[PDB]
Amino acid sequence: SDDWEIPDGQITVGQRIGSGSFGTVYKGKWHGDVAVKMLNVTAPTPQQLQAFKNEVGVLRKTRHVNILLFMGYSTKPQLAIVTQWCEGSSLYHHLHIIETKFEMIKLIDIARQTAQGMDYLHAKSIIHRDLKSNNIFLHEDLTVKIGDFGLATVKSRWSGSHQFEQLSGSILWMAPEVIRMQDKNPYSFQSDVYAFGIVLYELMTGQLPYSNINNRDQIIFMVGRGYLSPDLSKVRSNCPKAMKRLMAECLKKKRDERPLFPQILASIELLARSL
């Protein structure tokens, strides 16, 4: 396949929803409700532009129950991304704003489906680079939908033929090797696996990590230094011992100790049965 490009006059851009680490979302219409994220790189270079078209080729070939559908892009008014529109609130809204109250049965299930979709992405060798509760939606309060995955080339604006990831995103989910931005490609499967483990800390505590550190740069420095770690004492009393141990493996400071998603997902379904 090739031209995945939507023309102008086809996307009824609607209300402004919000901005994130690399775009601004509007609820657009396009054969039904879609989500149009106006990228921050509005003026792209034909070297960056062709890498984007190459990465859209992989994202367009993704079909999983736990993955948000990627419906192509546009280059009319300005470079934009068209994805599935999600009803309901994101996981971040449920856990930290609405304070929706789930049982452990439901919480583990959310964690199971998230590993389900994440394992698909790694099976197709796609690094999410942005896994966080903000990019996880509960579709009709049932199915988990992971979004904002991949798209490495529209983050970290290029120079001409270079994409040094000027690290961006939210720091709370960034692995320590991602924080340092030091060796070639900090973003890896284990960098995602760590971010996943932070999502577990969210589900199992109801809190964000480092609830007592209210300094953005203090977290960036101490985490990248190996001084600061998510305080696992904050886990709810009714959390399975098998879950708190899996959580601790994904948060290993050195990335080579963290497990991969085939092993993670197997552990979650096991403790879902012995519950």
Partner: protein, 312 residues
């Protein structure tokens, strides 16, 4: 307060216009123009239709739980008590359409961050006048209210055509500071080395930020890392390595040939890494550089309008 007469006139005059303002409503404003943005908000110049007053309006979109948000709005109401000529005038703070509006007085000069762009570098004669304002501003906050800024940087120092210099967006709401802590990475940091490894150590840690800001505005360049050998006679690091440079590398300094010794010394005492050894407000007030720059009669107002493009 320890002020003169052109200040007691301007101070009391603000409290008058502040009274012509009752309940603040989103519908009582007409948008004029934008003034600036930052990672975590945007500011507009607006007009209060129920009284014609022109104000700045910072809108903070925060995805926070309502219990926390109602605490933030409650905590922000302290800004009504801060009435100093070195603290930006404040009109009110409220919540609407999922956004927190902080309504403050309009400063047609802007932040020293934007002024630094139009100027390139800022003369030491002027930075002396700025240092006096920031030192008195942190003093008023520390003495009359026991609150500290925690974000002294060029973008939070505001100026205007009447030649005033004022601090703003200091940490009055502790809940607001913790909500902003889940923001995306920046590109630079004015955080003192102790705050990166631990927590605030009294007013000394705000002094480091003032010092690092003076060095940037003096040389027209963020000074971490220090300028190159021939970049300097011409007179990008990762966010982590900047923080790592602050914590483990010798503090930045001014060049030896271009600035006075009192100034080089004034910013050196401001940038000592140990917060206890670092100078405090009592010492900086009577420093040689401040003693001199307080005596001089520089035309700050005329220098500003010239630097931007305003009429005399």
């Amino acid at each position: 307060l320890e002020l003169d007469e052109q200040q007691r006139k301007r101070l009391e005059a603000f409290l008058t216009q502040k009274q012509k303002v009752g309940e603040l409503k989103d519908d009582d404003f007409e948008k004029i123009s934008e003034l600036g943005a930052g990672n975590g908000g945007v500011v507009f110049k607006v007009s209060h239709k129920p009284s014609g007053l022109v104000m700045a309006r910072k809108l903070i979109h925060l995805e926070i739980k309502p219990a926390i948000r109602n605490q933030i709005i409650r905590e922000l109401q302290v800004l009504h008590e801060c009435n100093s000529p070195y603290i930006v005038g404040f009109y009110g703070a409220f919540y609407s359409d999922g956004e927190i509006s902080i309504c403050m007085e309009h400063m047609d000069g802007g932040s020293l961050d934007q002024v630094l762009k139009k100027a390139g570098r800022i003369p030491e004669q002027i930075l002396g006048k700025v240092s006096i304002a920031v030192i008195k501003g942190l003093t008023y906050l520390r003495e009359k209210h026991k609150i500290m800024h925690r974000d002294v940087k060029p973008s939070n120092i505001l100026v205007n055509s009447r030649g005033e210099i004022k601090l703003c967006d200091f940490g009055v709401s502790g809940q607001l500071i913790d909500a902003m802590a889940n923001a995306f990475v920046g590109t630079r940091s004015y955080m003192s080395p102790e705050r990166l490894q631990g927590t605030h150590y009294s007013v000394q840690s705000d002094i480091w930020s003032m010092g690092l800001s003076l060095v940037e505005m003096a040389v027209g360049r963020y000074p971490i890392p220090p300028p190159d050998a021939k970049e300097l006679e011409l007179m990008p690091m990762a966010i982590f390595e900047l923080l790592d440079y602050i914590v483990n590398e010798p503090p930045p300094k001014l060049p030896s040939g271009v600035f006075s010794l009192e100034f080089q010394d004034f910013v050196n005492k401001c940038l000592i890494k140990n917060p206890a050894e670092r100078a405090d407000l009592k010492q900086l007030m009577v420093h040689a550089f401040i003693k001199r720059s307080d005596a001089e009669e520089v035309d700050f107002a005329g220098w500003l309008c010239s630097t931007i493009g305003l009429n005399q």
